[PDB]
Design a protein around this motif. Structure first.
Motif, PDB file in Angstrom:
ATOM      1  N   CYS A 193       0.830  -1.193   0.000  1.00  0.00           N
ATOM      2  CA  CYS A 193       0.000   0.000   0.000  1.00  0.00           C
ATOM      3  C   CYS A 193       0.870   1.251   0.000  1.00  0.00           C
ATOM      4  CB  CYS A 193      -0.911   0.017   1.231  1.00  0.00           C
ATOM      5  SG  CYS A 193      -1.979  -1.442   1.407  1.00  0.00           S
ATOM      6  N   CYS A 201      -2.221  -4.702   0.374  1.00  0.00           N
ATOM      7  CA  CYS A 201      -2.939  -4.210  -0.794  1.00  0.00           C
ATOM      8  C   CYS A 201      -2.950  -5.253  -1.912  1.00  0.00           C
ATOM      9  CB  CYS A 201      -2.323  -2.898  -1.295  1.00  0.00           C
ATOM     10  SG  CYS A 201      -3.032  -1.507  -0.348  1.00  0.00           S
ATOM     11  N   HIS A 202      -3.869  -5.052  -2.832  1.00  0.00           N
ATOM     12  CA  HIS A 202      -4.184  -6.021  -3.872  1.00  0.00           C
ATOM     13  C   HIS A 202      -4.689  -5.277  -5.095  1.00  0.00           C
ATOM     14  CE1 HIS A 202      -4.262  -9.269  -0.778  1.00  0.00           C
ATOM     15  NE2 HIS A 202      -4.715  -8.292  -0.018  1.00  0.00           N
ATOM     16  N   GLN A 203      -4.094  -5.526  -6.253  1.00  0.00           N
ATOM     17  CA  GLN A 203      -4.562  -4.906  -7.493  1.00  0.00           C
ATOM     18  C   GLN A 203      -5.652  -5.743  -8.170  1.00  0.00           C
ATOM     19  OE1 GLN A 203      -2.393  -3.977 -11.833  1.00  0.00           O
ATOM     20  NE2 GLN A 203      -1.426  -3.231  -9.932  1.00  0.00           N
ATOM     21  N   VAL A 218      -6.387  -0.565  -6.721  1.00  0.00           N
ATOM     22  CA  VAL A 218      -5.707  -1.272  -5.666  1.00  0.00           C
ATOM     23  C   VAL A 218      -6.511  -0.992  -4.422  1.00  0.00           C
ATOM     24  CG1 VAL A 218      -3.527  -1.494  -4.374  1.00  0.00           C
ATOM     25  CG2 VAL A 218      -3.482  -1.011  -6.805  1.00  0.00           C
TER      26      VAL A 218
END
Ligand code: CL
Ligand code: CL
Ligand code: CL
Ligand code: CL
Ligand code: CL
Ligand code: CL
Ligand code: CL
Ligand code: CL
Ligand code: CL
Ligand code: CL
Ligand code: CL
Ligand code: ZN
Ligand code: ZN
Ligand code: ZN
Ligand code: ZN
Length: 129
Positions: free
Chosen positions: A63, A70-72, A104
């Motif tokens: 992040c 975090c994750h896209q 994200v």
């Protein structure tokens, strides 16, 4: 500000989930009703919630704060950015900018009495690509 006692996942839904697009000036009234002052900027994601929570399953990435939660998104989605151009509550007037971009989200396990369907839920929008 997020009301006391509300979960982060629930707040995220109010702030950013907009599966059927709405005009900024209408949609920002529900964003602005907790402070009853005009938020300067907000992004709305035109996806079903379940599709955003599915993004919590992609590989973990940093992040903006440096933390690896975090994750896209798999792909670009339709979203609308709203930007305050004038006014004072209840007259918050926004300029919209409709875009197709990936995003994200930061994710964490659900809390309290959040649904049990998803083991990781979005808690904030970290960037729009
Ligand atoms: Cl949020
Ligand atoms: Cl509410
Ligand atoms: Cl309320
Ligand atoms: Cl935002
Ligand atoms: Cl939703
Ligand atoms: Cl962050
Ligand atoms: Cl932390
Ligand atoms: Cl395109
Ligand atoms: Cl956010
Ligand atoms: Cl952020
Ligand atoms: Cl961004
Ligand atoms: Zn409320
Ligand atoms: Zn941390
Ligand atoms: Zn947010
Ligand atoms: Zn962030």
């Amino acid at each position: 500000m997020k009301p006391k006692g509300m979960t982060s996942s629930q707040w995220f839904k109010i702030q950013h989930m907009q599966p059927s697009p709405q005009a900024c000036n209408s949609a920002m009234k529900n964003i602005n009703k907790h402070t009853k002052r005009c938020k300067d900027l907000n992004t709305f994601l035109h996806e079903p919630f379940s599709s955003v929570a599915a993004t919590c399953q992609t590989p973990k990435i940093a992040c903006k704060n440096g933390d690896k939660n975090c994750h896209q998104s798999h792909g670009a989605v339709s979203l609308t950015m709203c930007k305050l151009t004038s006014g004072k509550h209840p007259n918050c007037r926004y300029k919209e900018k409709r875009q197709n971009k990936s995003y994200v989200v930061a994710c964490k396990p659900p809390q309290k009495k959040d649904s049990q369907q998803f083991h990781l839920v979005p808690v904030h929008l970290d960037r729009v690509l």
